[PDB]
Design goal:
It is classed as transcription. The entry lists the keywords transcription factor, histone fold, basic leucine zipper, heteropentamer, protein-DNA complex, transcription. The assembly is heptameric. Chain A has 1 helix and no strands. Chain A is an all-alpha fold. Chain A has one domain. Chain A is rod-shaped. By secondary structure, chain B is mostly helical. Chain B has one domain. In chain B, 71% of the residues lie in helices and 2% in strands. By secondary structure, chain D is mainly α. Chain D is built from 4 helices and 1 strand. In chain D, helix 1 runs antiparallel to helix 3 and helix 3 packs across helix 4. Chain D is globular, with a radius of gyration of 16 Å. The interface between B and D is large, with 63 and 65 residues. The complex binds chloride ion. The structure holds a DNA duplex (37 and 37 nucleotides).
DNA sequence: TTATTGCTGACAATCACGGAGGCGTTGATTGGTGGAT
DNA sequence: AAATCCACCAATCAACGCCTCCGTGATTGTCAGCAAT
């Protein structure tokens, strides 16, 4: 019948909606992982810049000592 | 869509107010109309937050949990935790 | 004078929606009408009144 | 703050009155069997108010039912809050100003600022 | 105020009625069971990936909190070392 | 090949829910007078 | 003195609630192949 065909195309659309989302999630994990890999390298440099800033001030204090 | 679809019936809101107060008290036509606008906004305010969250998850339907979540997001905890009780007795 | 930071976002989102919908309604006037429906406004006058304005 | 919003901007006897209402609202919701057909505010109009936003498309049967109860309480809470101002200024007539006064008390009614700026 | 800890039960899951009738032949029993495992296994992985999303989301938030703590401490160390050095300097003079 | 279980589509069958579309039937809408505040 | 304005009434009819048909999802079942072991 015509109703039966309305189910086929509706499921073919449902199966495409799952195929898109599983690909979308797999891509979203790769994006997040790259963004997160940038943030962890950013802070490590900021820690090193602050750590280096201490060594300057700390070696200056020992100079008076 | 009609013009007054954005509001609720004045008589209904006015009836709820009458009950909230003692029998000797009276309410101003101005106040009735004010309350009407406030309670009508209360719905539209919450619904807008629930809707924008729905359009992130890509869900066309708006269910009770989206309303309860929208209320705790906008700082209506007492309302959200109170209507959890009404939804939980409905769902079963 | 500080407004709730939780609500703030939505108050702005609504302020837009209130304005756009009001322009679509073309009800630039904030004033409410004296009555709504003709037939009920007509019937309100039709009905038999009393000495104190009460309907019979 | 789950029960922080119950008593905001209120002091002394005013808090106690509102708290007793919420505890009654809870008790009625917890115990009494609810006819989900019976409502003060009609469900049709609550759905229309919601659907007035073109952003909204489809709505569940639940959301209107939750708003109906959620509104009946919301009104009753404000109307009571507002009565304290009238009773404080020796008035037996609730005025737009008496509501406006109650709304300012709590930072919960910050969304209504556009509705009654006063 | 006082209120019991209520729990929202989940809305009834849509779908076809799960066949209660046992299959009469082992060849169709091993088939449905293996196809039940096909739908069980695939539908679970998309939920496990939504969990994998939150695992990285939460394992990064605690890392962010730890790095934003570690720099604030090493930010005070500089300001401490800066003024303390100031005190030893002008006392030498 | 033959023997054996998994997996893999592809279509079909239930089941739930949301809408819109009439069709009963209800209760919201509405204004003048008194007299308080 | 000044003013306003809200509670009284309940009868028509807009519209509220309700059921049916139509449309779109979900979830499951099964037949007929593949796919390694
Ligand atoms: Cl009820």
């Amino acid at each position: 019948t015509k109703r039966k065909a309305q189910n086929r195309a509706a499921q073919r659309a449902f199966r495409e909606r799952r195929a898109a989302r599983v690909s979308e999630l797999e891509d979203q994990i790769k994006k997040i992982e790259d963004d997160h890999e940038i943030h962890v390298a950013t802070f490590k440099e900021q820690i090193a810049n602050l750590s280096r800033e201490v060594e300057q001030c700390r070696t200056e204090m020992g100079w008076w000592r | 869509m009609k013009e007054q679809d954005r509001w609720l019936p004045i008589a209904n809101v006015a009836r709820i107010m009458k009950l909230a107060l003692p029998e000797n008290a009276k309410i101003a036509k101005e106040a009735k109309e004010c309350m009407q606008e406030c309670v009508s906004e209360f719905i539209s305010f919450i619904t807008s937050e629930a809707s924008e969250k729905c359009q992130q998850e890509k869900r066309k339907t708006v269910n009770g949990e989206d309303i309860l979540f929208a209320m705790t997001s906008l700082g209506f905890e007492n309302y959200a935790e109170a209507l959890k009780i009404y939804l939980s007795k409905y769902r079963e | 004078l500080y407004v709730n930071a939780k609500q703030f976002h939505r108050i702005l989102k609504r302020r837009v929606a209130r304005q756009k919908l009001e322009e679509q309604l073309r009800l630039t006037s904030k004033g409410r009408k004296p009555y709504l429906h003709e037939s009920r406004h007509n019937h309100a006058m039709r009905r038999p009144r009393g000495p104190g304005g009460r309907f019979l | 703050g789950t029960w922080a919003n119950v008593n905001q901007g209120l002091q002394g006897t005013a808090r106690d009155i509102l708290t007793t209402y919420w505890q009654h609202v809870i008790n009625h919701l917890e115990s009494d069997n609810h006819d989900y057909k019976i409502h003060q505010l009609p469900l049709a109009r609550i759905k229309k108010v919601m659907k007035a936003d073109p952003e909204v498309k489809m709505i569940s049967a639940e959301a209107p039912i939750l708003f109906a109860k959620g509104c009946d309480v919301f009104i009753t809470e404000l109307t009571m809050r507002a009565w304290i101002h009238a009773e404080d200024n020796k008035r037996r007539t609730l005025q737009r100003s008496d509501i406006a006064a109650a709304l300012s008390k709590s930072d919960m009614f910050d969304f209504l600022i556009d509705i009654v700026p006063r | 105020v006082t209120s019991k800890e209520w729990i929202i039960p989940p809305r009834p899951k849509p779908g076809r009625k799960p066949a209660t009738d046992t299959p009469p032949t082992k060849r169709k029993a091993q088939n449905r069971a293996a196809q039940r495992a096909f739908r069980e296994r695939r539908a679970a992985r998309v939920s496990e990936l939504e969990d994998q999303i939150k695992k990285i989301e939460d394992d990064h938030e605690i890392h962010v909190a730890t790095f934003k703590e570690q720099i604030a401490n090493l930010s005070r160390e500089v300001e401490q070392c800066r003024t303390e050095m100031g005190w030893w300097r002008d006392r030498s003079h």
